[model samples]
Target: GTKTDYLMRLRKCTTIDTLERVIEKNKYELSDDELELFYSAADHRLAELTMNKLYDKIPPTVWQHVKHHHHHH
Candidate 1:
């Protein structure tokens, strides 16, 4: 649906595994749901969000690092 498309576009989740690992390692403060959503949007077939949206999913502390150079940005 368009909503999903909107959600998908908002999220810049990369299917690149290495980059994702870096996200997990660098932002160790991510919550379990945040981690799953991050990995899910990128690695999984179904995506429902972006780093901004995920920021909402993750702890505020980790959210601070959502804007990173090494990230999909």
Candidate 2:
């Protein structure tokens, strides 16, 4: 699957573990640019989880590279 497939999984992630699992396993299949977009969803989901009363448990260090992109939509 491509980034969009992973991004869809990212959107459905209800737990940080679930999100981290998908990324860690499939990251090798993605490009730098694609992973940047993948992380965009991760970043959003992380924020949502926090707002939903979950603690901010940061994922793997790889996520540190997540591009801080603005949503134009």
Candidate 3:
């Protein structure tokens, strides 16, 4: 298989869960070049899902606000 083959698989991944599985399982199969593209496509899809507000129903268990500063009581 070639890079395009992996690209097709990556493009077909519809969910973040599935994408993460493919990424984690295929680290050796996907070279760094292909891995970057795969990661980018996954990121784009995640943005789509975020904008759709699907996470309110099924939030990722390991997510962070990344940039928030609040005083704790």
Top lDDT: which candidate number?
2
My TM-score estimates for the predictions, one after another, are: 0.28, 0.54, 0.47
Q: Write the per-residue lDDT of candidate 1 for residues 12-71, one digit (tens) a residue.
A: 543444554556563566566465555544332222122322332333343344444234
lDDT of 2 at 9: 68
Q: Tell me the lDDT of model 1 at 26.
A: 30
What is the per-residue lDDT of model 2 for residues 1-73, given as tens digits with 9 covering 90 to 100? 5656655667677887787777777678777767777765567567546445322335555357443333433
What's the candidate order when arranged by decreasing TM-score? 2, 3, 1
In candidate 2, position 34 carries an lDDT of 71
lDDT per residue for candidate 3 within 38-72, as digits (tens), equals 66444434544444432211234323442222333
Local distance difference test, each candidate: 0.41, 0.60, 0.52
Better model by TM-score, 1 or 2? 2
* Model 1: residue 6 alpha-carbon error in angstroms: 13
Off by over 4 Å in 3: 1-8, 53-73
- For each candidate, how many residue pairs have backbone atoms clashing (under 3 Å)? 1, 0, 0
> Which candidate do you rate higher for TM-score, 2 or 3?
2
